[PDB]
């Protein structure tokens, strides 16, 4: 299957027609997505198979063909870009200044952008094009708007 | 079964649309990986 680095849609034919359930990142021969997109299932890439290699429900992350390779982090100051890949629509970059999720175990960057659930797994990038995390696990705040954590693994 | 399809390169776009606010929120993360607001 296709091993070229880049952003990919994650699709299924189980439901009506062809449905986009999420998005992921191919980097250094490893496919990276959120756990809630695949539930840890195997994936097809052309005539090839991608098997899960590492995953964690609490982090809501999963890697295929090898260990998690994405290690860039938001610097806490600069604007970033969501490389949003929505269902049935072209990849589009949106620039934003992240907010913060404050937890009992430390702070994480968060982006306040709302896209269909099938956009989950889209990469958030820094100014050098490095992936600092994936979009799609977050919360619905007071006024009903969606805010996603910038979710990053550990390399 | 699930399958993947390429959608693009991972690059920063010079002069992209700039939007969204930057809220500072107190949140909790449960064992199921769900985030919730703390008040
Ligand atoms: N309530 C709500 N609004 N947007 C969402 C999501 C966007 C990407 C993954 S879930 N969920």
Ends apart, CA distance between termini of chain A: 24 Å
Based on Cα principal axes, name the global outline of chain B: flat
Tally of discrete structural domains of chain A? 2
Specify the number of helices of chain A: 1
| Structural class by secondary-structure content of chain B | mainly beta
What oligomerization state is this entry in? heterodimer
Count the strands of chain B? 4
Please describe the biggest sheet of chain B, giving its number of strands, its sense, and whether it closes into a barrel.
2 strands, antiparallel
- CATH superfamily name of the largest domain in chain A? Trypsin-like serine proteases
Q: Determine the strand fraction of chain A and express it as a percent band.
A: over 45%
Radius of gyration of chain B: 17 Å
Instruction: Give the radius of gyration of chain A.
Output: 15 Å
CATH architecture of the largest domain in chain A: Beta Barrel
CATH topology of the largest domain in chain A: Thrombin, subunit H
Q: Please state the structural category of chain A.
A: mainly beta
Order of helices and strands of chain A: EEEHEEEEEEEEEEEE
- Helical coverage of chain A, percent range: under 10%
Placed side by side, the strands forming the largest sheet of chain A appear as 1-2-3-7-6
Main β-sheet, spatial strand arrangement of chain B: 3-4
The largest inter-chain interface, given as chain pair and residues per side, is: A-B, 70 and 33 residues
- How much of the sequence of chain B is in beta strands? over 45%
Domain Peptidase S7 (chain A): 1-155
Subcellular location (chain A): Host cytoplasm; Host endoplasmic reticulum membrane
Membrane topology (chain A): Peripheral membrane protein
Active site (chain A): 36 (charge relay system), 60 (charge relay system), 120 (charge relay system)
């Amino acid at each position: 299957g296709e091993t070229t680095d880049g952003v990919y849609r994650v699709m299924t034919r189980r439901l009506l027609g062809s449905t986009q359930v999420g998005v992921g990142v191919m980097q250094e021969g490893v496919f990276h997505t959120m756990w809630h997109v695949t539930k840890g299932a195997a994936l097809r890439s052309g005539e090839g198979r991608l098997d899960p290699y590492w995953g964690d429900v609490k982090q809501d992350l999963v890697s295929y063909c090898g260990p998690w390779k994405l290690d860039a982090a938001w610097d806490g100051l600069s604007e970033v870009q969501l490389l949003a890949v929505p269902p049935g629509e072209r990849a589009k970059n949106i620039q934003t200044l992240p907010g913060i999720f404050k937890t009992k175990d430390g702070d994480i960057g968060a982006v306040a952008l709302d896209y269909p659930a099938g956009t989950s797994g889209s990469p958030i990038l820094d100014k050098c094009g490095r992936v600092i995390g994936l979009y799609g696990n977050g919360v619905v705040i007071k006024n009903g708007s969606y805010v996603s954590a910038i979710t990053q693994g550990k390399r | 079964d699930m399958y993947i399809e390429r959608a693009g390169d991972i690059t920063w776009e010079k002069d992209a649309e700039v939007t969204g606010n930057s809220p500072r929120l107190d949140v909790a993360l449960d064992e199921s990986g769900d985030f919730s607001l703390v008040e």
